[PDB]
Design a protein around this ligand. Structure first.
Ligand SMILES: *[C@@H]1O[C@H](CO)[C@@H](O)[C@H](O)[C@H]1NC(C)=O
Ligand SMILES: *[C@@H]1O[C@H](CO)[C@@H](O)[C@H](O)[C@H]1NC(C)=O
Ligand SMILES: *[C@@H]1O[C@H](CO)[C@@H](O)[C@H](O)[C@H]1NC(C)=O
Lengths: 257, 195
């Protein structure tokens, strides 16, 4: 009758579900009022184990997400792709054994809370250690723990994974000038451990373009029959592993008729 | 006791640069087998597991050519044996598409249905030969036979879900295929509301 989901309280901007709930479905508000919701707070949901993209996608205005002291075991890839204004996320007190920085790549986070989760020490959480050190999203303030395969529990700041750092990247050209109607070739290459994926994120280019592969991962970008509409385009390459991301770019210049 | 047999063999895919391709494998056996895909770790290559890890979809998106063109292998394993099947990925450029390559004329839309009510997701496609429509939900093929009888694929191509249940909620896409290749619609979510 209200649209507000059972055992939550709703206003036009906030949804609070803090009373113990046995349910396993994420609370969905019924109505097009969804895009104006800026704050969702969930707590004491012991059976809420997974968070799906489909649960988050309607809340396009969301700025603050709290899922706290509940049963959360995992979050689907790209769960937050449609919540670009999400700058505060609290996942403390759940059952998270691991977490990927890729979940957060599209967001500008001010606060991300991860205390009281059962993390396993691995290279998949090196990024968290790194965010801590560089003061990202208030991780520096937090006392997180992880577990080794021998069951020893340590402070995250004492974790010591070898051969596990940020990817490096380079490109063959600093700038590139081409005549309209001709071709051009350039290479981007990533290195590091573990070996990064490498992509030319160049979909909005108007010219026809092909991507071919070549302890280093190199992708050749071929531009064919180049058009003037791509003059001044920034050709961007990205190099990604589980630890983090590096970017490199080549300015394209197209001259002629 | 019985070694692994594939009850779903992956099929070759010819996709479009910028689009999606999927390969499905699933294996039976006693004990229940475990399957895995094979060939670097990429957001563009996603494995979605099902049937308690005895099934897996390899989903590649967005497609890049020529770099993604390859043979991909699904390996199934239990204590009585290990076995493998293969499938091929081709990726065409937008300017290379043959005239009858599948086209999505109108794709599925966002929909909300009340639980127990009927819901129909719509899809309409064209191409030459006349393209065959199948459905995917949460990156997984939809199998009407397990619904069961509850869910039908219509002649028009729509997915009809009678007696809506909570597990019918999810992200749906229709897939149009013919000898020229495969084309995915944009996704649409179906939400299942209370009562
Ligand atoms: C939501 O907010 C926007 C702009 O602030 C407005 O267009 C829309 O009518 C609002 N919806 C409701 C249900 O108040
Ligand atoms: C961590 O231990 C490894 C050997 O396991 C070594 O590579 C590295 O120097 C050590 N670093 C610290 C800070 O203990
Ligand atoms: C290249 O692009 C031009 C300008 O759009 C087009 O008219 C022509 O058909 C193409 N020519 C070649 C050689 O690719």
């Amino acid at each position: 009758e209200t649209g507000c989901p059972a055992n939550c309280l709703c206003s036009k901007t906030d949804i609070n579900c803090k009373k113990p709930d046995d349910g396993n479905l994420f609370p969905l508000l019924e109505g097009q009022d969804s895009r104006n919701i800026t704050s969702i707070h969930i707590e004491n949901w012991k059976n809420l184990q997974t968070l799906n993209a489909v649960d988050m996608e309607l809340y396009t205005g969301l700025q603050r997400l709290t899922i706290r002291n509940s049963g959360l075991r995992n979050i689907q890839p790209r769960a937050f792709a449609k919540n670009p204004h999400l700058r505060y996320i609290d996942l403390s007190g759940n059952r998270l054994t691991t977490l990927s920085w890729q979940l957060f790549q599209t967001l500008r986070l001010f606060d991300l809370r991860l205390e009281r989760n059962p993390f396993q020490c691995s290279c998949d959480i090196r990024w968290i250690q790194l965010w801590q050190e560089k003061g990202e999203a208030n991780l520096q303030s937090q006392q997180l723990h992880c577990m080794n395969l021998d069951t020893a529990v340590i402070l995250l700041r004492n974790m010591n994974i070898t051969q596990c750092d940020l990817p490096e990247i380079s490109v063959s050209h600093v700038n590139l000038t081409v005549r309209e109607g001709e071709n051009a070739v350039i290479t981007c290459q990533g290195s590091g451990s573990p070996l990064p994926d490498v992509d030319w994120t160049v979909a909005d280019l108007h010219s026809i373009n092909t991507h071919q592969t070549n302890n280093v991962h190199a992708i050749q970008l071929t531009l064919v029959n180049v058009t003037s509409e791509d003059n001044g385009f920034l050709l961007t390459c990205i190099a990604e592993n589980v630890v983090g991301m590096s970017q490199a770019s080549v300015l394209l210049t197209v001259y002629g008729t | 006791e019985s070694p692994p047999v594939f009850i779903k063999k992956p099929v070759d895919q010819i996709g479009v640069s910028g689009g999606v391709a999927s390969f499905v494998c699933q294996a039976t056996g006693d004990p229940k087998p475990r399957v895995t895909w094979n060939k670097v770790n990429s957001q563009r290559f996603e494995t979605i597991e099902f049937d308690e890890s005895a099934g897996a979809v390899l989903r590649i998106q967005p497609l890049r050519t020529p770099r993604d063109e390859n043979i991909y292998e699904c390996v199934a394993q239990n204590p009585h044996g290990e076995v493998t099947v293969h499938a091929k990925l081709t990726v065409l450029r937008e300017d290379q598409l043959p005239p009858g390559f599948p086209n999505i004329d109108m794709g599925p839309q966002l929909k909300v249905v009340e639980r127990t009510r009927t819901a129909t997701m719509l899809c309409a496609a064209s191409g030459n030969p006349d393209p065959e429509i199948t459905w995917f939900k949460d990156f997984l093929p939809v199998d009407p036979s397990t619904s069961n009888g509850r869910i039908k694929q219509l002649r028009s191509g729509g997915l009809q879900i009678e007696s809506s249940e909570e597990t019918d909620q999810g992200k749906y896409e229709c897939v149009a295929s013919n000898s020229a290749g495969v084309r995915y619609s944009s996704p649409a979510n179906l939400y299942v509301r209370v009562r």
